[PDB]
Amino acid sequence: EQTVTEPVGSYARAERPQDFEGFVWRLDNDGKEALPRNFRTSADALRAPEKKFHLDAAYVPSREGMDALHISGSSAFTPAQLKNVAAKLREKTAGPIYDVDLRQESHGYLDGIPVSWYGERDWANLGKSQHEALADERHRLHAALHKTVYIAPLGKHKLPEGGEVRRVQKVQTEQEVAEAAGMRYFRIAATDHVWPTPENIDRFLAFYRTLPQDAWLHFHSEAGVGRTTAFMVMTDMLKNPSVSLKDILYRQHEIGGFYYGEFPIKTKDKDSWKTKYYREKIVMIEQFYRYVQENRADGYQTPWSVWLKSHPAKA
Template sequence: MKYKGFIQVVSTALMLFHNQGFSLSNPESCEASRAKPCIVQDTARKTAPVTNLRHSRMIGEYYHGNIAGVQALLASASEAPSKTGWEDIARYIRNQANYKPNHVLVIDLRQENHGYLNGNAITLCDLHNWLNLGKSTDQTIADESRWLQSLAVDPAIENVLTSQQFDKQEYNAGKIIPIKTLQSEQDLVQSMGFAYLRLAIADHRAPQDDEVDKFVSLVNQLPKHHWLHIHCRGGKGRSTTFLAMYDMLKNADKASFNDILARQASIPPYYDLTQIVRNAPEYTVYYQERLTFLTYFYQFAQQRLSGYSGSWTQWKVEHQLQNT
């Protein structure tokens, strides 16, 4: 692949160890805090169906407005699936677009530490899923690796919560799960033939500039006839944000800002990035910041399609948007 060298360069940089991390607390007692985060099993079972799975070309069927450029978008998105779910995703992409895993790049948008326990997706998280907030991708990967290594020391993991238990704040109601297999997502998906890239994006928030620069460079270097599969934890906010950014980078000269956000919201899970007031009001300010970021990113994408060759970070400086 032409982008293989790019991924290798990025991966080398990301794996640098930074001695900054959360406190590895006793899993028997968790409080959904930074000091005492909880381990949550996100997939109910390893054969659970993949939720929020969609591909960009569905827009042509679902959206009744401007669909210019949609057929050129080679991307799908979903939640973070189980191991079996990754097999389902491979079949889905092959059936929808005839792409095999060796022509698919998985973009993992999760800043939070996660992995695979006996084929099920697990996450180490605090109340807002911000355990690694402010950390770069290389710091996140180092912390995640250290966390997984610490879990592997024992034959079982204690107090593993279900998503429902975590939501109900039943923080000591988890079960003991013996370890049969314990893997990072990168190891799992690469063993299935996918290429892999991590971009550490905080849940509910706009992406950091360094991660935006990496994504723009990747899209610019991605050869034709290669597919992107984008995912976050639930397959909604972060995944829809990056699908919209991908659409903008390809089609900001063909479709308006409102059309791009509306058409991304027209397909499952129907996530509308313009809706900043949701069930949890404490996130409203961050949803507004994310929407503001997207308005500027659309302008940046328009200028790139007109010949601008600078990075997102450089463009922000030139437009005096350093703090945006």
């Protein structure tokens, strides 16, 4: 027919939340290193591209605007690691430093240990509104206080392996941990592995509009790869609209992020469900760039969700 059930950029809406409910408190960071994993800032030197993306290692992207961009990204962290990050970022700016938490999955800290309520594909909060996801999170964190919990790292086949059991004496939300490290906090509940929703992006752009000139944004997700890079890319496009799409994509990849341009996708058989979500992200990244280019001149009078509905992306 002519009516589409889920438009491009919303494929995840077709999945059934009940088939991915949370079943374990996953260890988000073992706390052994001084900093979170995949830590990088926009002032960093560009490195050779990762071979899996089949890029031109000889291409030198423009760094126009990177010194003033003021953003960084990383994986999840322990409280001590976030204090190290905050201290490092303070050496680069006198503006407010934001911990921009991009995780939809319920997470927090049990006795200072960074944990998340993990469901298959990390989709324990799939389908929930940001309100419902945050309510789940608060309820779960609180329920763990003075209770025995099993906290484990995921091993072979994304299933618990080893870990530890403890009776919890202290519970904190990431907001509390960010404030204790001297950072401002802003939450965007984005689903792991997929393109952020129009709701997620409209929320980010509204937040972006409120920032003072010297604000520094430290984005993070679980690994500091998929969601973190998507938002770092969006920020680079918004702040440096005259830079080419290719340069934005190459430079965000070359300072240590994911590469959001076209590349030959290949997954292990067990990860084949990811293929179309990668393809969806490549197309949406181009569509967001188009949104920025067509709406920056009038100051974004119309939001991303609205413009995308009248300018749908195509596979």
